[PDB]
């Protein structure tokens, strides 16, 4: 009965048109609340995007432990509930929501699975078995990616001025924000290091250290507000030269917070028009990241005025793509509502129309699975202009189809056919969309296609394919993919403009030595993370034009990728937030789907003691019925109680 109902409702919600999904979700939530399955109710409420219902369920929850585990789940998803000062353990619940102690937990997992030994970029390169500023940039990027969230390294934590000066031009920003991402996730004691670097005589280095502070605070939530202070102090008056590091660091630091103070600090710097078009685009991007999913009238209006005011040739010039991108990030997943914005953009300008319209439309219908919407996108794809709208449209099919386990593979087939029958821009874009549709999820057709098309004659298609393959391998350090990337490095040994992408893919594959995942979804394959999808869409829309953005001077978007960095975790906790090493078995997925057979049975049993670093698509269940798990699904941090029935 319960299993039948809940499973059928979930599957149909994933596989049903728009009008019925909401009603089915309502009745699913009602059944869960009736049977008193509060974590399930919370998951359904979040996937509904019903913060009011989320608060109602969370407050109705009068169990301290279950409430704290709900706080863990909501923190991992990304939300900062403003709980009133009368609840079960207000302070503990609030700090769990803020996601503090994540540094300690990550370090604890590293110690349990010893990975604290730093890995220098040359270690992953393994050049002893197989330039200049470009190589310095690539090495810094891969070093940061591999040593992210550890607060440890061997290049920058050791003598770091040498690395900074070996890097050139924007390599200064690259290295500084790489250090920031190394100290990511609650190394806020690292404000000391980043401050004693930003006390610098070099503008690029100082701004990169400001971006480092922002990225370190990214994901983190500290009531002391450790970002707004630095960011405002630097961005209040100097709005002429670059400002990109500051604005981007603020946006990455706060993201899903949606704090009116940061919104109203970021809006005027965009609306002033005294800051370069790059700053305007990055400011719209930061506003979108701060407000990923709001229907925020202020952000929408300011973006519309910016688009109107910017000259026709300015809109033609790149980096204008980030303004409609910011508007879409604001209208992330809100669905139909955007009609007003769509009409406004349609009446704004003729040629920039296709681009902005398609971008906002796809970014608003992300995950909807609207087949008619994807058909509109495919008709736009068929109509060849004789291109930017083409690329964002292919990205749109990916973004909208990454919601169903069947539609995803079918969109992979559609992407293969798109590359087969495509035009230059279509082919250039397809790898980015095909990376979006599968992130941190190695798949032996995605990897094969991307590897095949990396060698492709089109240099930009090669760039996108290599970065896409690194993306697919993100946080899943795999022998096959590492060997493939090393082989590609050998292939494009001489080509620096492509070897940089190859090295970036290597580092992004060995992300955190292998601890994290850039996949937007989490939990049990249907929970979109607005912040993570915003970051991924930022990076991929920037890559849509790869030469002049990433290979130029705008890899702060690569650093914005951090908005989607979340761990693959199974740490278990005591009722009073203490470690509980408990035997747990792991596996991918197995069951008999009769009526509504739950796909919770796991056959690839692999007994482990928590912490456990599970991979993509693996469900870890308890080894024995000695502890009951408050959460039905064991993902991320968990609180396990002692089964009063029997050990």
């Amino acid at each position: 009965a319960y299993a039948k109902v809940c499973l059928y409702l979930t599957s149909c919600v994933n596989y049903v048109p728009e009008p019925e999904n909401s009603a089915l979700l309502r009745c699913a939530l009602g059944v869960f609340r009736k049977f008193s399955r509060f974590p399930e109710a919370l998951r359904l409420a979040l996937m509904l995007n019903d913060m009011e219902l989320v608060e109602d369920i969370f407050t109705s929850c009068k169990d301290v432990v279950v409430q704290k585990q709900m706080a863990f789940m909501l923190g991992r998803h990304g939300v900062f509930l403003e709980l009133s000062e009368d609840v079960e353990e207000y302070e503990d619940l609030t700090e769990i929501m803020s996601n503090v102690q994540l540094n300690s937990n990550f370090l604890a997992l590293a110690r349990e699975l010893d990975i604290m030994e730093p890995k220098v970029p040359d270690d992953i390169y393994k050049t002893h078995l197989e330039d200049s500023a470009r190589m310095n940039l690539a090495s810094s990027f891969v070093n940061g990616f591999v040593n992210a969230a550890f607060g440890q390294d061997k290049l920058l934590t050791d003598d770091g001025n040498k690395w900074l000066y070996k890097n050139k031009d924007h390599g200064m920003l690259s290295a500084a924000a790489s250090l920031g991402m190394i100290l990511l996730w609650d190394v806020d004691g690292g404000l000391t290091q980043i401050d004693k670097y930003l006390y610098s005589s070099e503008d690029y280095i100082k701004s990169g250290a400001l971006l480092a502070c922002g990225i370190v605070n990214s994901g983190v939530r500290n009531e002391c507000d450790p970002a707004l202070a630095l960011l405002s102090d630097y961005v209040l008056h100097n709005s002429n030269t670059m400002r990109l590091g500051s604005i981007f660091g603020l946006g990455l630091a706060y993201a899903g917070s949606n704090r009116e103070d940061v919104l109203t600090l970021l809006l005027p710097v965009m609306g002033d028009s005294k800051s370069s078009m790059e700053v305007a685009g990055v400011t719209a991007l930061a506003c979108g990241m701060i407000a990923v999913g709001s229907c925020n009238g202020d952000v929408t209006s300011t973006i519309l005025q910016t688009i109107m005011e910017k000259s026709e040739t300015e809109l033609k010039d790149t980096y204008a793509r980030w303004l409609p991108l910011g508007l879409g990030l604001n209208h992330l997943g809100k669905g139909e509502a955007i009609e007003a914005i769509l009409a406004a953009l349609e009446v704004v300008s003729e040629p920039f129309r296709s681009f902005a319209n398609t971008l906002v439309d796809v970014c608003a219908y992300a995950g909807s699975g609207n087949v008619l919407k994807v058909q509109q996108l495919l008709h736009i794809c068929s109509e060849h202009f004789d291109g930017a709208h083409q690329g964002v449209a292919v990205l749109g099919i990916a973004l909208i189809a990454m919601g169903e386990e069947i539609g995803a593979e079918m969109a992979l087939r559609t992407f293969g056919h798109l590359l087969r029958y495509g035009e230059p821009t279509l082919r250039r874009a397809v790898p980015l969309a095909l990376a979006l549709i599968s992130v941190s999820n190695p798949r032996l057709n995605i990897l094969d296609t991307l590897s095949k098309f990396s060698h492709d004659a089109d240099p930009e298609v090669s760039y996108n394919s290599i970065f896409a393959m690194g993306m697919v391998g993100s946080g899943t350090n795999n022998a096959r993919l590492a060997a493939m990337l090393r082989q590609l490095a050998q292939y494009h040994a001489k080509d620096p403009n492509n070897l940089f992408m190859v090295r970036l893919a290597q580092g992004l594959t060995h992300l955190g030595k292998g601890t994290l995942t850039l996949c937007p979804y989490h939990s049990d394959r249907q929970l979109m993370s607005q912040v993570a999808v915003a970051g991924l869409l930022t990076v991929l829309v920037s890559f849509l034009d790869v030469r002049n953005i990433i290979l130029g001077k705008s890899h702060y978007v690569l650093y914005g990728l951090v908005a989607a960095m979340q761990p693959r975790m199974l740490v278990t906790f005591d009722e009073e937030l203490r470690p509980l090493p408990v035997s747990v078995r792991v596996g991918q997925a197995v069951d008999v789907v009769g009526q509504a057979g739950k796909p919770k049975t796991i056959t690839g049993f692999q007994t482990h003691t928590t912490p456990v670093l599970l991979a993509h698509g693996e469900r870890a269940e308890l080894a024995t019925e000695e502890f009951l798990p408050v959460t039905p699904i064991l993902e991320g941090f968990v609180i396990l109680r002692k089964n009063p029935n029997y050990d």
Binding site: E91, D188, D195, Y199, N222, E223, C224, A229, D233, Y234
Partner: protein
């Protein structure tokens, strides 16, 4: 200009890290 910004950042980030230290001390005392 640059020196004024640097001194402002120095004093105010010292204040910020001090506040963070108080937060962590409160957490540990609770623990």
């Amino acid at each position: 200009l640059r020196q004024t910004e640097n001194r402002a950042t120095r004093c105010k980030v010292e204040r910020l890290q001090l506040l963070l230290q108080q937060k962590r001390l409160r957490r540990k005392a609770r623990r």
